[PDB]
Design a protein around this ligand. Structure first.
Ligand SMILES: *C/C=C(C)/C=C/C=C(C)/C=C/C1=C(C)CCCC1(C)C
Ligand SMILES: *C/C=C(C)/C=C/C=C(C)/C=C/C1=C(C)CCCC1(C)C
Ligand SMILES: *C/C=C(C)/C=C/C=C(C)/C=C/C1=C(C)CCCC1(C)C
Ligand SMILES: *C/C=C(C)/C=C/C=C(C)/C=C/C1=C(C)CCCC1(C)C
Ligand SMILES: *C/C=C(C)/C=C/C=C(C)/C=C/C1=C(C)CCCC1(C)C
Lengths: 217, 217, 217, 217, 217
């Protein structure tokens, strides 16, 4: 109807994710070869999201409920790529070793695994939340004062601005999901749909903007 | 049948939108890198429209009625991109700051939100219509004598002609929708389908024409 | 079965239209930027046809009958593009004003509208047929001795040969449809399906041939 | 099950045809503009096959039986393109008139039409088989010592090797289908599925190999 | 549910394979013409997998059980391409005859055929396993000290590193499947799904990495 505001959000975010996927896959012509992968991922991320969003919608239509499990699946598939985007832009703008890529991947996977263990009752909720937040804070530290920051200090000002915007997205927009787990273990689907709009579309648009700016200039 | 003239329009506009989407995504080869995004959007707009048009048709088949709500959804997704097209062509033809982009986006979002609030009964119909028309007139003023006009005054004559045609489209073709809300709060689906044909296909064709002309010349 | 020869034709023409759509959209790599649009349209035409052909097949399977109305819909969408192809090849080979484009579009639309009015009983059959044939003959005259002929006289011999072949297609292959209306207002689906094979696939292949020849040479 | 070996073949050939279609449409980047069409066709052929293969599978699932009629439809669509491939490679490697294209098209169409007339009982089986085999042998002669051979004698050794391999495919792999008609008018679906694997995938791979070799060298 | 861990894996691997297919087909822009085919295959492999994975999921939903037979079908289609990847990278980096390609293809086909004969009871399980493992070991030897190793010794260090990583993947990740047949003839679906994740996605990513590195450098 006009009062649930959940199915509607579902449709809005689904169409926006489809459009973002097509946009990121099409706008690789405006960027150099070094930024193509970055854009490819931005597109894959949004495409995976859409795919899973579709299934969340089918399950919601059949028996309305939370797709948390599926939302751990998509997350399992998309959060690693979103955290790799930092390594991709650093590799396209300067010299980065790849140990940053490995440690970011490990941190994101550990965070998601412990979050799911807390969600399904396999592990105690408070320790699982603590370990997930520790992995999240470790990723934040690696992007703030670690290998990522050291590699970013040797990049152009446009790349540095994009890196700062992406880091602030990781700090604040990603903070919604741990706030949800906290609240749920102590509406949600609508908040998660909107969260994605920024986390997946605005993130990719920041990457696309810096890539197009660098390739033109 | 042959007398409703509504489902038929639905099929006509749906096929035209599909064709326009493919055309805009394919004809990016004829334009320079500066115009590619403009064409990408023209394609995304028409594509989103088609997508939502499909759902409007399924809902009409199941239980015939107005898709207003969905038509606020697609609009919510397409009107910002259509109003961004001005910024995109100005950026591809001359130097434009981006404050124009921000203010156009804010104005379009405010207009659509107040229109929906008037449509759903959340807010009083007359104040909602007044605020929506004020946002529309503010966008018209920004394109007529504001930052958009100032940026257009430093462009080539072909870009100026395209900008004037797009502005007149915004003034007149977009005027149909507030006329509908007025009439409905004081046939409609057919008028809205035809409205789109011009607002979404002719708009994109004007953009495509100016982009191809500039890229060849 | 093996005796209707109608559903079979439907499948043959549907697959041929799909293959032609893919061929035209793919073979734009072999042509210069000036001919890309021409090929894009040839592809869109065939694609729209396929789309509508699909629906004609669904309706025929559900309740076998004539899709005339839908066949006025697709025609409404494809005949303008087919007649525009003349303007597109003239623009890609020489200087043509565009008044030719406008007058061809108006003539084709008037012809189709009056044909539908005669088909649905809105207007008297004989006057509607007379007006439609007058619009058709006016288009033929414009292509034979008018602005189209004047623009074609200043083109390369290959473009002139393609223009003559397309004009003879317009004269003879398009003559089937008025012969059908005459016969029906004084088998048909099979004749219309075959008609399309030449009108839509051979037309586009003539355009593709001249475009590839000019781009290579 | 695991003993029919027909539905399984169907799945194997369907997936292989899909993969070949994608491969041929994608690998046009490795070839020059002169070979693009050749690859386009190789792709269209496999794509049409897949399309029709799908329907053959739906009909087999609904009421298991021979899709001969449909197999005359696809053949009607694909055999002309496969026999045109000779003209396409000769045109991309040397000067060929096009009378070869016309006579190959006529011969293939006559062969298929008489084969279907013999299959449906419209014409006597033995005369229809004789006329079809005469058309097939005429095509073989035109490729062996006719205009095709004359054009091939003025080509590079790689093109000559590809032409010889394609001609031997026409002689031997195509010989399965007349052997089937003979046997059936005096298992089969499995033999026809495998036949296609070579006739449609190996043929296109020979064309792709020679095109890539010539374009690189 | 949340305890089967099989259907979930199915969804995870299906989405990952789709994403990998799109990634490998899209990232051909970053590589030279010599590596395009390599990437094309990496994409086709993953694509075919996805396709078959879909059907495995439909069969599992309808009547839950092992898709071994279908898993011999996809394997029949994908293992040859995966083993051809060695020849493709060797051809894109140095001079390789093609006898390596032929012998690898024959070995993979023999291995799969004997494995299926052991699985279906056509041939005795122990002799079929012995012959399949002999073919596998022959392929390993050809890649370790045969024509493949001889061709790899004359390649750049990056290509040699990629070749070594792919060879170790063949040695260890491919060892899961014979270990399954052993265990089943003396959980499995989950192990096979994960096996694929590495065998099909990591293999293609190694190829993509070396191709992009060589093309940029
Ligand atoms: C597109 C989806 C995104 C970006 C999801 C991000 C999710 C997280 C950052 C989740 C984090 C969690 C913790 C930090 C600890 C508690 C459990 C989680 C999984 C909710
Ligand atoms: C493709 C759809 C388009 C371009 C839709 C445009 C819609 C508008 C300009 C709607 C405007 C309205 C007002 C100005 C005030 C009253 C309420 C609205 C939302 C109908
Ligand atoms: C792909 C479809 C094509 C090219 C259709 C062409 C249709 C016409 C040229 C129809 C012409 C008619 C008249 C000239 C007068 C009588 C009514 C019509 C609409 C049948
Ligand atoms: C992909 C399908 C192909 C290449 C089919 C080829 C079919 C033929 C060469 C059929 C030939 C026949 C004759 C030569 C005479 C008897 C009847 C036919 C149609 C079976
Ligand atoms: C994507 C699928 C892949 C890479 C599958 C690989 C499968 C094998 C290497 C199977 C090997 C077998 C033997 C070596 C002997 C016993 C039977 C088989 C077929 C299980």
């Amino acid at each position: 109807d006009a009062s649930d505001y959940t199915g509607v959000s579902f449709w809005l975010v689904t169409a926006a994710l489809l459009a973002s996927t097509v946009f990121f896959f099409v706008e690789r012509d405006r960027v150099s070869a070094k930024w193509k992968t970055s854009l490819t991922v931005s597109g894959l991320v949004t495409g995976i999201a859409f795919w899973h969003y579709m299934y969340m919608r089918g399950v919601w239509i059949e028996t309305g409920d939370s797709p948390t499990v599926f939302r751990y699946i998509d997350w399992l598939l998309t959060v690693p790529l979103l955290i790799c985007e930092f390594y991709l832009i650093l590799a396209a703008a300067t010299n980065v070793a790849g140990s940053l890529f490995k440690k970011l991947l490990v941190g994101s996977l550990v965070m998601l695994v412990f979050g799911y263990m807390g969600e399904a009752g396999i592990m105690a909720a408070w320790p699982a939340f603590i370990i997930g937040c520790l992995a999240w804070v470790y990723m934040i530290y690696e992007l703030w004062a670690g290998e990522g920051k050291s590699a970013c200090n040797t990049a152009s000002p446009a790349v540095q601005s994009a890196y700062n915007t992406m880091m602030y997205i990781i700090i604040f927009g990603w903070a919604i999901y741990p706030v949800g787990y906290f609240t749920g273990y102590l509406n949600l689907n609508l908040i998660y749909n909107l969260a994605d709009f920024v986390n997946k579309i605005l993130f990719g648009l920041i990457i696309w903007n810096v890539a197009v700016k660098e390739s033109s200039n």
